[PDB]
Amino acid sequence: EQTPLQEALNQLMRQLQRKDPSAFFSFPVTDFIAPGYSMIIKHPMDFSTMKEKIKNNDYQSIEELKDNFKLMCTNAMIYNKPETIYYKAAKKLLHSGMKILSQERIQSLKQSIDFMADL
Ligand SMILES: CCn1cc(-c2cccc(C(F)(F)F)c2)c2sc(/C(N)=N/C3CCS(=O)(=O)CC3)cc2c1=O
């Protein structure tokens, strides 16, 4: 049922989520938990939305997911002041995530998918 691409996106997703032990990124940010968020942040992103995009075959490439991942962390490092727990969690998630999605493994994951496609 799952495409090799979807299986690889889901695998990366599980890896990234483990770098969010507080689960601050698990669900869309609500205005209750972050007053005014809907008024300020232009392109909200969270893991649950990323997961639904993979399940719904919306991702065309690993790089799209990576872009969504970076957006998600940057939104959090803008909306929140540096001294906050959310900023600190976002900085760590971003640094760890950029190793999980480093340019090296994303395109060597993709040519392995392509290699297997050609066997
Ligand atoms: C990282 C995305 N994100 C997530 C949350 C969030 C989600 C679920 C549960 C909780 C918590 F209540 F358990 F902590 C937080 C929040 S909450 C929030 C919030 N209230 N931020 C204020 C902190 C002081 S401020 O920096 O002056 C301005 C905004 C921003 C985010 C966020 O970006």
Ligand SMILES: [Cl-]
């Ligand atoms: Cl790390």
